[PDB]
RNA sequence: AAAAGGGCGAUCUAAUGAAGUUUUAGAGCUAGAAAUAGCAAGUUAAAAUAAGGCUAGUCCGUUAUCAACUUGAAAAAGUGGCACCGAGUCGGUGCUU
DNA sequence: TTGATTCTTACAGCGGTCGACCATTCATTAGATCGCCCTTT
DNA sequence: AATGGTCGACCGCTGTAAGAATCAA
């Protein structure tokens, strides 16, 4: 028995745990070791860290589900088309679909003829010669009227249905609107027709290039408006161009309107909104919008269809045929130019599949960018290729028909081509003329997002309510699926429930009841003190609501005191400084319906609540129209349209029963009525909730009947990695309490922690910002990926190559002389993100180190900052922090706040994990039903321990080992315990419990909190070493800190060579193998793609994921003699379920015999094996091992490396040699690799002339060979050394397998040598 | 003090588009016994896209969870003595069952 | 002497380490939750 | 990106069977 505390450091991949006593010492105990070896007890130091792989998210699984459902629904649409064409195709070919389905099978396995389309070689070659691509057949079936073969018609319709197109456009993209210049001219003409006085016209503009550019839509709008001098952005023509581009302009100032008239062509309500505009402006303007609409139809198709739609009714097919013909002609010309000028490279461009070129781009499957980059120098070093470079610069040299650009193809063009083919070929076939709507619906149908999967109770993701338990088809969807109820289930499935009434839903934030509740709760507290004479009469509040809250939207206090406190009651008040509780939806519905008596009717309030809930639920217009038809008879048709135009979003916090349905028995009144009137004492909502006399609190506690630990962890808001770390943390705490014999700690001080993907995201952001900024910086200075990791160059390309503190330009390759400056002082806020860093020539450009850059900088750079913000190059937070100088800058309050943020946590995830720890530890209540808090759950911040290390020479290098996690946990425990002992008045900011305005006081208090740990003070007179050696607590005889003994204990603890580093063994869960489908080969490693497909004939997968390995000792045959061998086999995820419940069967199926079913051992990943000489290996897979030994470098060398990497140490030179010797000894002891060690030694002896700083910085990197885990690569002065992978597991078969507990204190060893 | 409005971030769900890959179809010509050499043409299409599963749906199948043993049916639970000297991954020495 | 036997001993087959090479992507739409940093009212 | 599957080349091990004795009868 003792009084101990626990220290925890929570991370996304690690959980450090440590145990301290009242003397800040770490106890050591002997633990029993089970198994077969003679070791029955091992001593350990009760401090360590649990390592674990990061927890991944469900985003990948969701993507897989969506892809699988998309594929299956496409296959089902094809099957619907086949079911339609079956009976008619039987009269033409009985084996047509049979040959189409068997196209994948080889002729050896093909039951019918090879050619699927027809069944003969002659007509097959004839069709492929006459129609080379399928777009030829598309255009032939669209344009020509001759009766074609039913097989070709089915092929065209199937290619249209299989790849329909994006449903991002609502309505009908009219193909007749194809040219941008003609439609822009028509828009200018109809604009001039409207106003003859000031006709805005410009013939020198070219809309086809300005409006159809690759820039941002707003940038194209700006470029077009800049070309016309008479027009402006706020003008009506600017809004017309915005509508043509789809920027959702507003026509308030253009038509002298008093309301907002926002029109968006992509939205569904547009027409209605348009009509509303046509109800306020003259109808003669309507044609203008029509023209604008036409422009919006031609500005998109300009990229989709490149041919005149009047030439043929298949514009996309014609564009594809033009692609094919241009490809053919350019390929012929290129072959001629190669055979005429440089034939020596012909075999390299038209015959090699490995290298790039026409043979690698077609047959080798190379990229189009690689193709262009490979041909660019060849076209530059030629004569008759000066014109082909014009097409290669626009990425249109040798274009295929199925490229990525085809993503921009909407389903409307394919629907039009299908309708054309159907109308042409229906005059010959009866079923085609009779079943046109069927195929049109097959290609048009799209399951709504608010319906989900079409399941009958076998899908945990589905929510659709069926009107009839029948098979759902694209034709009877609206009759089998209740779309309204499905959408309501979709929305209510994801909304929150009332925190006080868990079995009740929450009304929307725009509910009239919620607004009444807020107004009444806000109005209950009012001074209203006249001369001489807070009563808050219920009738008076009702009169105020009827006269002010129901007449004006925002009730301001100056108008309040003059309307009721002066006019109603004659007088000549300080409750609330506006009220922040307006009846906004009340006035909205009033302006919509123009009937105050209907709103003030108590009987009609239920209908109003249902209307508001319906407006909040659905977003689609058809849903709200179907759900508002029940109230159609109540209002006028115009009022009905205006109410269907209104749309609300957002949800409140309280249920409907908590606002008005609840009523105390003894009080005999509802809670809303209590807020309206409560006698002389007008109580509040919180007063009504937490009152010992109110029956409310008891019923609220009774309604909360209920769960598990994992369920509570999953409900927490945060990344899954943090939640996994938290779960491992509570497991570690449970096991630690178990080690202490079910004794609870006195304190638990817990502290949490705050790439090609990042490079790609940075490249995307820079490209988008420069495109919307219209700068040529990406063209002048070519930027490549993975180079933006450098902060200087990243900030250069983010600031368009110019300073943000002055108007000068920045020079490439001079960035080392330029400096990065923090927008807020690093002394105040310790933020090193891009939202706080600015690349400038000199720091003196900033106004002062005290505060934000002065307003003299803002008044000059605000325009540039706004241009950067509008280009999405800087966050709005950075704009605010830069321009804060105009708003007074930083005062003394926000400085104290920034200083306190660095010490106090104020993080909700930390609060929740502290609540979890407190609810798990403190579970006893006393006589007065008060919680007995035995364990203080202290929440500490990383900055505190980091400053402690930096101030007291307790440096730690992360690259050395994993001990730093345990050490940080120990330091957190020590610092938290000492802080609570020194300053108990601060327990409200650390210990989890119920617990200019002296701004400089708080600023200075939170600045030197830890100065009582120091051993000296620096007064203006000098360095006075008169610091109390025994720091104690005021009015408490307890000693808090001892400078003579406690530091020694901390140094000894950090110098301990035994730390419990444990790697969590986990079964690999995920995909079956690599997703790539490799071609066929003569190897058993190819996994079959289908049960009826052969890998050597069709290819398949290559690298399966090994999980749940099995050590087995059995006899195998090899004159077919049986030899008894022991080996571990790697089960794959695909065959994991089959291996379960069938050990002997699955093992004999692979070739094993006489398998000892009782000796089969299950081994996950990272399983620990001690071999010899203290070497430990972790089973990485079936045939790979990982370093499992931790190097314990002495703290002297750690501090030396830290001080020499920074340079201020000037430490001993031979320390480098001593560290090299220790690394070499550790390597020779546990690292089986010796060639890498010899290479390291040679490189070190070669680079001895380098300074001590660089030598230490590279010795830090050298520790990779001695780190725990998978071997990796490392560089020592540009001398990279490859990893040495342990490609065998034969030694592990006789090793000592160690099953370690969560903390590693309870071990079980098994000698595997006694199994063969 | 509070609301509101933005702006970034962590997640979760549903509906879609385009590519990618694989097998097959798209007859390759000439010379030559052959090995192979010389030419021509190449852009497209079908089918699959986790093996598959029963619960038979136009459903589900890559998230979370996992040291050992003993139970339970799963979840989950239970199972391992304490001080003192030291410290290279923990070793001893005392007590106590 | 002669087949069999008994080593026996040098030559082809086996199943271990170095050294690369590779690893399914882009893009929309519609919602719902929590969490933090700001300004504005 | 990471770290494990996979193929190619190499390569020491190894066990194996074809001489080389080696008895015995």
Short mmCIF file of C-alpha atoms in Angstrom, two decimals, chain A residues 333 605 741 828 1295:
data_model
loop_
_atom_site.label_atom_id
_atom_site.label_comp_id
_atom_site.label_asym_id
_atom_site.label_seq_id
_atom_site.Cartn_x
_atom_site.Cartn_y
_atom_site.Cartn_z
CA UNK A 333 1.54 12.78 -91.13
CA UNK A 605 -50.05 26.83 -34.50
CA UNK A 741 -4.09 -4.70 -6.08
CA UNK A 828 1.97 35.15 -27.43
CA UNK A 1295 12.41 -18.91 -30.35
#
